[PDB]
Symmetry: C2
Subunit: 253 residues, 2 copies
């Protein structure tokens, strides 16, 4: 029933590497929880999906390798990037002298299958990083894998013609409803749209009810307000939607 | 088709709190990505599931509150636990004097729906923590929510009679096959069973093929080897399996 009859597993990595290999010294901490297809009745589709998941989580340079190898190389690269940069920096800050908490680094990459129905595979990537400073950054990314065309769906695969201005107004109208307000200013006073206009984003995901547009920190709100989701039901976009059978499959579910 | 027709969403929290509220000082960093049911055609089932997910991710003290409230209280508690303990400790280490990297703390809690088919809901919790030291700890926990009995499945809900000794031998036999070896000693020389016997764990998950027993770091291998999964197909346990309709539903899928 589901395209490629995909089965998944994950690779977990958790590494603490201290400067100078000394436990009393600052460390970098890496966490990987990577979901990837292990079995398929279409290995072409399996290789395609693995390439996109690896490219999105770790980078294009890692294409062609087994995920276990990718995660190993990625982990070594991160530790060596950290040590070769921060060890001479720490020795310098020490030569002058207490040194700061500017040397404790964290990077987390988690990915899992959010939805897998008929010709659609929704892959969610959670990313977080801290390199000293007041705070770090955290991001949620989505891939809407078209299991026929073996590529992620973009807005111009889901919408016909010139829809940017139209979708912008739908997004504003929906957020106004969610926050029980009747003005752009009322939303703006709550901080929505205070870092910029609520334009449609390529960071979205499909589900049985509609399209959820996912705004990461800074996109439309200040960092401190966190991410924000704006969901548009399919019923409100009927005439704007494309011919891709995934749209019909989502609407039917 | 799926019991309670459940719809899910998540609460994301990312907080950096520095000692003395000073960016130049060490910090604690908390990450929460909590999945919870938002909509159901059986609100009794929805409240039950929310209680278990909150209890498992944050603790029993948080039962009865909305997940947004829970995550807020949990975050404040973590920051205050950190500051009220480590601020006088840091002031003391400073009074003597450079101070260590013993003060950079990290805690991550992520949860998501792994499987939701008919009367079964498999909930995966990913936990990680670092409090200084050579390394931290990371754990993956599973809840096999029985959507009829409104509680997680335990081994004695899935197996009949005295199955511990039997399951132990199945687990050893399966790991031997996975690592292409014919002795307990051959596995032991690879480190498997070097921290203790491979007894059945309550940390398992059901899927269309069988039961995956999830061993966290230290359970049966040294920390450095990471977690290990041992999957037993339903075909190899046919006569040992109980009457719970979820077993039949998994076997049929
Ligand atoms: Cl180290
Ligand atoms: Cl702070």
């Amino acid at each position: 029933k589901n395209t490629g009859a995909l089965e998944f597993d994950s690779i977990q990595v958790n590494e603490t590497a201290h400067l100078f290999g000394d436990t009393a010294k600052p460390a970098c901490n890496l966490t990987i929880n990577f979901a990837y297809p292990v079995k398929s009745t279409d290995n072409k589709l399996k290789d395609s999906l693995n390439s996109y998941f690896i490219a999105a989580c770790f980078g294009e340079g890692y294409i062609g390798e087994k995920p276990a190898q990718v995660v190993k190389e990625y982990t070594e690269h991160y530790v060596k990037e950290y040590r070769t940069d921060l060890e001479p920096m720490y020795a310098e800050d020490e030569k002058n002298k207490s040194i700061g908490a500017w040397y404790s680094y964290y990077k987390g990459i988690e990915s899992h299958v959010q939805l897998y129905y008929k010709n659609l595979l929704v892959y969610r990537i959670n990313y977080n990083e801290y390199t000293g400073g007041a705070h770090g950054i955290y991001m949620t990314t989505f891939l809407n894998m078209d299991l026929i065309n073996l590529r992620p769906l973009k807005l111009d695969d889901i919408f016909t013609g010139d829809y940017k201005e139209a979708l912008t107004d739908l997004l504003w109208n929906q957020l106004m409803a969610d926050k029980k307000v009747t003005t752009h200013e009322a939303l703006e006073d709550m901080g929505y749209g205070s870092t910029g206009d609520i334009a449609p984003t390529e960071n979205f995901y499909l589900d049985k009810d509609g399209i959820t547009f996912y705004y990461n920190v800074y996109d439309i709100t200040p960092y401190a307000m966190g991410p924000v989701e704006i969901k548009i039901p399919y019923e409100m976009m009927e005439h704007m939607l494309g011919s891709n059978p995934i749209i019909g499959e989502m609407k039917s579910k």
